[PDB]
Amino acid sequence: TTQSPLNSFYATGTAQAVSEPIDVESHLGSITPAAGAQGSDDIGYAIVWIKDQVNDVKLKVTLANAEQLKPYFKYLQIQITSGYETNSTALGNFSETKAVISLDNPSAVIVLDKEDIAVLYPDKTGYTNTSIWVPGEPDKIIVYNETKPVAILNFKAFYEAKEGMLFDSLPVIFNFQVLQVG
Amino acid sequence: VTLANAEQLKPYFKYLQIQITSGYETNSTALGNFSETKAVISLDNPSAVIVLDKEDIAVLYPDKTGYTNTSIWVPGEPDKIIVYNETKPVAILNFKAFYEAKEGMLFDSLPVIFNFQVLQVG
Amino acid sequence: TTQSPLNSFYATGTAQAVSEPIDVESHLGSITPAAGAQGSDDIGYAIVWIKDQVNDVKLKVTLANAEQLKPYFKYLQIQITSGYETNSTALGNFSETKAVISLDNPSAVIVLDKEDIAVLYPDKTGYTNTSIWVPGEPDKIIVYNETKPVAILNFKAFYEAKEGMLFDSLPVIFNFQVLQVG
Amino acid sequence: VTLANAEQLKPYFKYLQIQITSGYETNSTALGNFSETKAVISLDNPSAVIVLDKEDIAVLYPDKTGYTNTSIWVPGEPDKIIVYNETKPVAILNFKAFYEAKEGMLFDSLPVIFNFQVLQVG
Ligand SMILES: [Ca+2]
Ligand SMILES: [Ca+2]
Ligand SMILES: [Ca+2]
Ligand SMILES: [Ca+2]
Ligand SMILES: [Ca+2]
Ligand SMILES: [Ca+2]
Ligand SMILES: [Ca+2]
Ligand SMILES: [Ca+2]
Ligand SMILES: [Ca+2]
Ligand SMILES: [Ca+2]
C-alpha cells in the first residue's frame, strides 16, 4: 500500500548575532601647553562596553593621525591604563597599565580579561547598592545597580611641544580594532 | 539524528556542537527520574545513531499504587507538563549547544534544522 | 528487531581559562637630581598578583624607553629586588635581589618561585591575624587576613645626570613579559 | 572509554590526562569500601578498555543482617547518596584530571566529552 521512508520528522531552531562584541564611547580631554614646553596631563577615559557572553577581548589601539601630529610635537606618548573604583568590596578596585603608544610606535595590542571587566550582581550580598566610577573621579558614575560588563581605559599623555609652533584645534585620533573575542 | 543544514551553518560558526540527552522528571516515585546523554553532533559529524529502550520511554499506569495522580515534565522545568494521568509512552530529548561564532559575522534569522530517521523498531 | 551499536553513552564536562597568569600594578616614584649630579634613590614597588594554581613565574623586565632616556643620563641602572615583610612568623620576611638593568642592557629574565610568592592561611596557627607590607614601609599593607598569592618587586635607581641638561617630566617605562607559567 | 573531542582540546592544552577510578563507600560493613583505579587516558591515547567485575559492582540486600539500613555514596562525599535500602547493582567511576594549559590561550566554555562503548556482557 504505502511504504514510508521514515524521514519526515524535523525540529528547527534559530540563531543570530546582531551586535558587535564591544562598544566604545569617548570622553577624552585636551592638551594645552605653551609653545615648546614639557609636561604631562591626564586626557580622560574611554568606556568599553562588553556584550553578551563575551569574556576576553584582544584589541589594537592606534594613533590614527600620528603623521599629522609630528610637525607640532617633538615627542608625544600616550599611556593607557585599565582601572575602576567601586563600593562593592566584593569586586574591589582595579588598576592595570596596558600600553604606551607614541608617534614612532602608534599601535599596541591590549588584552582585557576577567579582572579588566567589572560586573555587578545586584541580587547578591557584596553588590547590594554599589556603583562603579572612573578612578579618582567619584562624580562620574558608570554603572549603578545593574549588570553591565564594562571596561574603563584611562589616558595620560607625555608630550614635548615643538619650539615656536603655534596651533589651535588639531585633533588627536585613536582607533580601536577588535582582533579576537571569546 | 542529523544536522540537516550543517553546510549552511558553517560560514557563521567556527564550531557548533549539539548535545542530546534523554531524560524526564516525575512524581511517580515508582517510575523515577531519568537522565541519559545519547549523542554529540557537530558541523563535522552531523549524524549520530540513538537508541531508546525501556528506561528512555516513560509510561504511567493510573490504576496502580505508584501512579496515582502523577505527572511527567521536562527536566528542570516543572511548569511544562507532558503527560498527566494517562498511558502515553513518551521520550524527551533535550538539546544543548556549544558554539563559537565567527569573528565579525552579523546574521539575523538563519534556521538550525535537525532531521530524525527511524532505522529499526520493535 | 533492533540491533544496538552500544555507543549512545556520554559524559560531559567543561574547561575555561578566563584570566591571565599575573596582574601588575605600579607604585613607582620619581628621580629628582640636580643637573649632572650623581646619586641613588628608591623608586617604589610593583605588585605582582598570582592567579589560580600558578606556582612558578618566569618574567622578562625591559626598560621600554631606554633610547629616549639616553640623552638625559650619562648612565642609569635599575635594581629590582623581590621581598616583603610580615607578622606571620610562620611565613617570615624575605628579600631577594633579582636583576640589574640599565640603558645598555635594558632587559633581564626574572624567576619567581615558592619563596618569592607570599601566601597567608588565616585558618591556621601561624597566620592568625597577620598582614603583608612593603619592606621598610609598614603603613603600606598589601594583604590582610586573606589568601592572595602576591609578589612584591622593589625598584632602586643608580643614575648619572648629563651635564647641563634641564628636563621636566619625561617618563621611565618598564615592560613585563610573561615567558613561562606553572 | 574514549575522549571523543581530544582533537578539539589539543590547541588549548599542552597535555591533559584523565584518571578513572572505580570505588564507593558504604555503611554495610558486609560489602565494604572499594577503590580501584582502572584507566588513564590523554590527548595522545584517548581510549582505554575497562573491566567491571563482582567487586566493582555494589549490591545491597536489605533483608539480610549486614545490609539492614545501609547506603552507598560517592567516595569522600557522604552527602551524595546513590542507593538506599534497595537492590540496584551500580558502579561508580570517579574522574580526576592532570592538565597543562597552553601559554597565553584564553577560552571560555569548550566541552570535554567522554564516550562509553560496551564490548562484552555476561
Ligand atoms: Ca623645548
Ligand atoms: Ca615644563
Ligand atoms: Ca564568552
Ligand atoms: Ca572568537
Ligand atoms: Ca522491526
Ligand atoms: Ca657629572
Ligand atoms: Ca652626589
Ligand atoms: Ca600550578
Ligand atoms: Ca606553562
Ligand atoms: Ca555476551
Side-chain angles (χ1 to χ4, degrees):
Chain A
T1 307
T2 307
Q3 172 66 261
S4 299
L6 296 161
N7 297 337
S8 69
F9 308 97
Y10 278 91
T12 285
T14 61
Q16 65 182 357
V18 287
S19 296
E20 264 171 328
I22 67 157
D23 272 331
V24 178
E25 73 164 299
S26 70
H27 303 254
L28 301 193
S30 62
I31 295 145
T32 74
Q38 189 170 5
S40 72
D41 208 0
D42 300 336
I43 294 174
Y45 54 98
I47 296 166
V48 186
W49 303 105
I50 314 284
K51 288 328 179 160
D52 272 341
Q53 56 209 270
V54 173
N55 286 90
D56 303 291
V57 184
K58 198 165 95 191
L59 300 152
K60 177 183 176 180
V61 189
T62 311
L63 192 47
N65 70 323
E67 294 293 328
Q68 159 175 65
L69 297 174
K70 272 176 209 193
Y72 309 89
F73 285 98
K74 181 196 166 68
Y75 78 78
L76 168 70
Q77 286 159 321
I78 312 286
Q79 167 203 287
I80 306 142
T81 77
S82 178
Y84 52 88
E85 293 179 353
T86 178
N87 290 318
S88 180
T89 188
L91 167 76
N93 296 13
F94 191 66
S95 184
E96 182 66 26
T97 301
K98 286 285 182 68
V100 177
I101 56 177
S102 76
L103 304 172
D104 290 333
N105 306 305
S107 58
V109 176
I110 291 175
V111 166
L112 308 160
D113 60 83
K114 181 178 174 66
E115 296 91 29
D116 300 71
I117 303 164
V119 184
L120 309 166
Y121 300 102
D123 51 310
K124 292 181 181 180
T125 61
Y127 316 82
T128 300
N129 189 359
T130 62
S131 300
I132 291 168
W133 64 84
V134 189
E137 293 179 353
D139 53 310
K140 285 151 163 178
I141 299 188
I142 311 298
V143 174
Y144 181 75
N145 289 319
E146 79 185 293
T147 296
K148 287 183 77 176
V150 65
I152 310 188
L153 305 191
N154 315 269
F155 290 86
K156 185 173 181 178
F158 300 90
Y159 47 89
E160 181 66 26
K162 196 168 288 293
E163 280 286 317
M165 181 60 72
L166 279 299
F167 45 93
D168 189 15
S169 299
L170 74 165
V172 187
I173 306 154
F174 301 98
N175 176 220
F176 308 77
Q177 184 178 2
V178 175
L179 302 166
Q180 281 176 327
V181 175
Chain B
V1 189
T2 311
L3 192 47
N5 70 323
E7 294 293 328
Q8 159 175 65
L9 297 174
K10 272 176 209 193
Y12 309 89
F13 285 98
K14 181 196 166 68
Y15 78 78
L16 168 70
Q17 286 159 321
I18 312 286
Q19 167 203 287
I20 306 142
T21 77
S22 178
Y24 52 88
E25 293 179 353
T26 178
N27 290 318
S28 180
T29 188
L31 167 76
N33 296 13
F34 191 66
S35 184
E36 182 66 26
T37 301
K38 286 285 182 68
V40 177
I41 56 177
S42 76
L43 304 172
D44 290 333
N45 306 305
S47 58
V49 176
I50 291 175
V51 166
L52 308 160
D53 60 83
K54 181 178 174 66
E55 296 91 29
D56 300 71
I57 303 164
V59 184
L60 309 166
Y61 300 102
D63 51 310
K64 292 181 181 180
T65 61
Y67 316 82
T68 300
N69 189 359
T70 62
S71 300
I72 291 168
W73 64 84
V74 189
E77 293 179 353
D79 53 310
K80 285 151 163 178
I81 299 188
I82 311 298
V83 174
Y84 181 75
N85 289 319
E86 79 185 293
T87 296
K88 287 183 77 176
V90 65
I92 310 188
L93 305 191
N94 315 269
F95 290 86
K96 185 173 181 178
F98 300 90
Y99 47 89
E100 181 66 26
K102 196 168 288 293
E103 280 286 317
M105 181 60 72
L106 279 299
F107 45 93
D108 189 15
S109 299
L110 74 165
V112 187
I113 306 154
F114 301 98
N115 176 220
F116 308 77
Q117 184 178 2
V118 175
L119 302 166
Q120 281 176 327
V121 175
Chain C
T1 307
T2 307
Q3 172 66 261
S4 299
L6 296 161
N7 297 337
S8 69
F9 308 97
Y10 278 91
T12 285
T14 61
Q16 65 182 357
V18 287
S19 296
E20 264 171 328
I22 67 157
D23 272 331
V24 178
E25 73 164 299
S26 70
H27 303 254
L28 301 193
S30 62
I31 295 145
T32 74
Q38 189 170 5
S40 72
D41 208 0
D42 300 336
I43 294 174
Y45 54 98
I47 296 166
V48 186
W49 303 105
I50 314 284
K51 288 328 179 160
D52 272 341
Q53 56 209 270
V54 173
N55 286 90
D56 303 291
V57 184
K58 198 165 95 191
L59 300 152
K60 177 183 176 180
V61 189
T62 311
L63 192 47
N65 70 323
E67 294 293 328
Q68 159 175 65
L69 297 174
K70 272 176 209 193
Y72 309 89
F73 285 98
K74 181 196 166 68
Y75 78 78
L76 168 70
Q77 286 159 321
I78 312 286
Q79 167 203 287
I80 306 142
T81 77
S82 178
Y84 52 88
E85 293 179 353
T86 178
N87 290 318
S88 180
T89 188
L91 167 76
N93 296 13
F94 191 66
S95 184
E96 182 66 26
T97 301
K98 286 285 182 68
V100 177
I101 56 177
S102 76
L103 304 172
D104 290 333
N105 306 305
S107 58
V109 176
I110 291 175
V111 166
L112 308 160
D113 60 83
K114 181 178 174 66
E115 296 91 29
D116 300 71
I117 303 164
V119 184
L120 309 166
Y121 300 102
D123 51 310
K124 292 181 181 180
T125 61
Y127 316 82
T128 300
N129 189 359
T130 62
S131 300
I132 291 168
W133 64 84
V134 189
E137 293 179 353
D139 53 310
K140 285 151 163 178
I141 299 188
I142 311 298
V143 174
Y144 181 75
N145 289 319
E146 79 185 293
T147 296
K148 287 183 77 176
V150 65
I152 310 188
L153 305 191
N154 315 269
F155 290 86
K156 185 173 181 178
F158 300 90
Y159 47 89
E160 181 66 26
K162 196 168 288 293
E163 280 286 317
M165 181 60 72
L166 279 299
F167 45 93
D168 189 15
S169 299
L170 74 165
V172 187
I173 306 154
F174 301 98
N175 176 220
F176 308 77
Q177 184 178 2
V178 175
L179 302 166
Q180 281 176 327
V181 175
Chain D
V1 189
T2 311
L3 192 47
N5 70 323
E7 294 293 328
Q8 159 175 65
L9 297 174
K10 272 176 209 193
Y12 309 89
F13 285 98
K14 181 196 166 68
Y15 78 78
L16 168 70
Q17 286 159 321
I18 312 286
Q19 167 203 287
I20 306 142
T21 77
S22 178
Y24 52 88
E25 293 179 353
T26 178
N27 290 318
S28 180
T29 188
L31 167 76
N33 296 13
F34 191 66
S35 184
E36 182 66 26
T37 301
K38 286 285 182 68
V40 177
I41 56 177
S42 76
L43 304 172
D44 290 333
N45 306 305
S47 58
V49 176
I50 291 175
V51 166
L52 308 160
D53 60 83
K54 181 178 174 66
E55 296 91 29
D56 300 71
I57 303 164
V59 184
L60 309 166
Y61 300 102
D63 51 310
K64 292 181 181 180
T65 61
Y67 316 82
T68 300
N69 189 359
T70 62
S71 300
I72 291 168
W73 64 84
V74 189
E77 293 179 353
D79 53 310
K80 285 151 163 178
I81 299 188
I82 311 298
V83 174
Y84 181 75
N85 289 319
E86 79 185 293
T87 296
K88 287 183 77 176
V90 65
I92 310 188
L93 305 191
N94 315 269
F95 290 86
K96 185 173 181 178
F98 300 90
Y99 47 89
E100 181 66 26
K102 196 168 288 293
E103 280 286 317
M105 181 60 72
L106 279 299
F107 45 93
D108 189 15
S109 299
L110 74 165
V112 187
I113 306 154
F114 301 98
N115 176 220
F116 308 77
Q117 184 178 2
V118 175
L119 302 166
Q120 281 176 327
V121 175

